[PDB]
Amino acid sequence: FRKMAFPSGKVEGCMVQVTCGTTTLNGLWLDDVVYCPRHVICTFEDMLNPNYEDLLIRKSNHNFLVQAGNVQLRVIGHSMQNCVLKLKVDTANPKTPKYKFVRIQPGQTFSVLACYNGSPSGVYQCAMRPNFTIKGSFLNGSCGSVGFNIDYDCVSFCYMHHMELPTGVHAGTDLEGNFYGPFVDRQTAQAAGTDTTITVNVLAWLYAAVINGDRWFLNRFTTTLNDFNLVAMKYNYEPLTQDHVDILGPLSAQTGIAVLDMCASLKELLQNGMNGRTILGSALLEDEFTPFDVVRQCS
Amino acid sequence: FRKMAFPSGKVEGCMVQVTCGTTTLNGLWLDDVVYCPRHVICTMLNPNYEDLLIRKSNHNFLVQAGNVQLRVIGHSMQNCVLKLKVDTANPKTPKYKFVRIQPGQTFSVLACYNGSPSGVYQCAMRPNFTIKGSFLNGSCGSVGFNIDYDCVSFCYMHHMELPTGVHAGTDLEGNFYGPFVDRQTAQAAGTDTTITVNVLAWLYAAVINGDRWFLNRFTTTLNDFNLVAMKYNYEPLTQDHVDILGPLSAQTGIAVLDMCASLKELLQNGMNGRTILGSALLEDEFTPFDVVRQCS
Ligand SMILES: COc1cccc2[nH]c(C(=O)N[C@@H](CC(C)C)C(=O)N[C@@H](C[C@@H]3CCNC3=O)C(=O)COP(=O)(O)O)cc12
Ligand SMILES: COc1cccc2[nH]c(C(=O)N[C@@H](CC(C)C)C(=O)N[C@@H](C[C@@H]3CCNC3=O)C(=O)COP(=O)(O)O)cc12
């Protein structure tokens, strides 16, 4: 059981380079529109307080250079949707997959395709933290990289990358250009709210560990939903809902460990620590696997 | 630092399925050859692969890209891989090479089932020539690779899950990594060791990021370090390992043998609760290339 990303080939065919003035970043080319962060239209004098509609009215179509590989695509239009710039081009992307734009919930996971100068560099799995950051791996020039999920040939795009907080975590928007979290596309040091641990995911991951032959953390005891939630809130864990209990159903069905039985195991791990033992190789409780992630991989 | 795979699209375009009788596995379609594990021809406790392949003709092999059949016009065996010549050159063939990697080297795995990609993740080849994968029935023939300047270097084809749950396989010339054989038998790997060259890379990563309390005023010979490292279940360093630490050594200004003396102190003295890049455990699945990848 490993942190597994989706195959990224359908996304790689959509990545292009967008340049305006001195600024270069990555864009997503679907059919005849290129999506990229709007701060590509920006110079130094506005980065503390850019009036984006005012900056965009002053740009022409020819101010935008879009490159797909060596080929240049001609911009025939432009518009802005929140923090995302939409550049209409005169060529459809023939590699456009079946796709949707989705806004994910905190605790859900997605694959990031890290790109630089329109060229894909790496792929890895991330979770939308409860404080709406993601713990990613992004360097200078990674803006416009996208995160996505795949099911039955449909790519659901959920994240476009915009910024790295002083603490090294990352922030961005959905593909309608709305930030996850309280962040803003201005050149300032921004702080996130206090993060918490994704409780339903830690439980899913404990179930994955039992599916893969590890049981040392289980115990004889059980707890009520509310008593577990009291202890979990004490340790800055998100609350566990009956919907989460339902969603864990299949995994408890497979292993024959009732959800509130596994909650008792987690409560002991939280109150006692792991004592140097490891679960699935980790010395830390892992919260970036969803129930679906576990099921889809283990079977 | 993340475990980060290479983008998989150039390899996705080369995955097909190969069926013999009712056994289906993954194959790799490059130009007009499809490579796959030879045990696709098996019905297994100790196959006579030479004798089994004599009873097989071109028309016993069903090669499909999706649901499109590619006609087999030739077949041969090279070690534990089957090579099927097909009548169509793969138009998505990337620039490619077959390479045999060394313990410690990392690569991306594209886990496939029935010729269809399922996921991608990074693996490290352990000193006992196993990898810590995520593979189910139907995954044999999935490949591992590195991508460098759009050239895909294929280094791994998947064959086997050991009783302990780790995995074993061949290079693309069909030679197993490790002492394993492609039989339906419980095989045990040798006792594993810590990948020293990669721990050193990780210490360099820490230094690059300002975390350098562990550096000291001593140095060591390679031989002295290796004899001590073996006593702590660490792999000995080779000349090639010292060479691939060069770029990180130059960037930090810390000599490789100086960094070996620093690690030697960590092994004999432990961590003392202090952390290195956030943890009390030393990480051994990032190569020097992985480190400069994620730092620059
Ligand atoms: C005083 O200000 C600060 C103080 C303290 C921390 C700070 N952090 C940021 C920030 O992150 N700012 C965004 C731009 C604003 C307009 C949203 C940015 O820099 N995004 C990067 C990706 C980033 C770059 C490194 N790792 C990434 O993930 C692009 O890729 C586009 O930038 P470039 O095209 O390369 O100029 C500003 C800032
Ligand atoms: C009694 O013997 C044993 C005892 C204890 C442990 C054992 N382990 C194996 C083994 O590994 N056997 C190979 C076949 C031989 C000929 C090499 C195999 O099963 N490979 C899988 C991938 C595997 C499947 C699950 N996870 C994987 O990694 C394929 O994919 C091809 O087989 P399939 O037709 O697709 O099922 C035999 C064995």
3-state secondary structure of A283: coil
| Distance from the alpha carbon of residue A118 to the mean position of ligand 1, in angstroms | 17
Size of interface A-B (CB pairs under 8 A): 77
- Data resolution in angstroms: 2.0
- Listed by number, the residues of chain A in 246-275 with a beta carbon closer than 8 Å to a beta carbon of chain B are none
- H runs (alpha helix) in B31-163: 49-54
Q: What fold is seen in the domain B9-170?
A: Thrombin, subunit H (2.40.10)
CA separation for the pair B279, A194 (Å, rounded): 21
> Across chain B, how many H-helices and E-strands are there?
8, 13
Q: Alpha carbon of B98 to those of A257, B80, B101: distances in Å?
A: 46, 15, 10
Tokens of B57: 């003709």
Q: Is B169 exposed, middle or buried (0-12, 13-18, 19+ CB in 10 A)?
A: buried
CATH class of B196-295: mainly alpha
Provide CATH 1.10.1840.10 ranges for chain B: 196-295
Provide CATH 2.40.10.10 ranges for chain B: 9-170
CB B260 within 8 A of CB B222: yes
Count of CB atoms situated within 10 Å of the CB of B33: 17
CB A76 within 8 A of CB A84: no
- H runs (alpha helix) in chain A: 9-12, 52-57, 199-211, 225-234, 242-247, 249-255, 259-272, 291-298
CA separation for the pair A131, B117 (Å, rounded): 32
CA separation for the pair A111, A120 (Å, rounded): 13
CB A51 within 8 A of CB A45: no
CA separation for the pair B122, A123 (Å, rounded): 10
Q: Is B52 exposed, middle or buried (0-12, 13-18, 19+ CB in 10 A)?
A: middle
β-pair type (B81-86, B72-78): antiparallel
Q: Is the CB–ligand 1 distance for residue A25 below 6 Å?
A: yes
β-pair type (B15-20, B23-30): antiparallel
One-letter amino acid at A166 equals P
Query: Chain B partners of A5 at a C-beta cutoff of 8 Å?
Result: 5, 119-121
State which H helix or E strand residue A30 sits in.
strand A23-30
Tokens of A271: 């109150």
**From the candidates A1, A8, A115, which should be mutated to test the interface with B, based on the most B CB atoms within 10 A?**
A8
State the CATH architecture for A199-298. Orthogonal Bundle (1.10)
Provide CATH 1.10.1840.10 ranges for chain A: 199-298
CA separation for the pair B94, A56 (Å, rounded): 40
Q: What fold is seen in the domain A11-173?
A: Thrombin, subunit H (2.40.10)
CB B107 within 8 A of CB B171: no
Phi and psi at residue A284, in whole multiples of 5°?
A: -120, 150
Query: Chain A partners of B280 at a C-beta cutoff of 8 Å?
Result: 283
State which H helix or E strand residue B207 sits in.
helix B196-208
Which residues share a beta bridge with A78?
A87
Q: Cβ neighbours of residue A14 under 8 Å, at least 6 residues apart?
A: A28, A29, A30, A93, A95, A96, A97
Q: Cβ neighbours of residue A261 under 8 Å, at least 6 residues apart?
A: A218, A222, A252
CA separation for the pair A162, A16 (Å, rounded): 16
State which H helix or E strand residue B257 sits in.
helix B256-269
CA separation for the pair B229, B194 (Å, rounded): 9
CA separation for the pair A288, A280 (Å, rounded): 13
State which H helix or E strand residue B187 sits in.
none
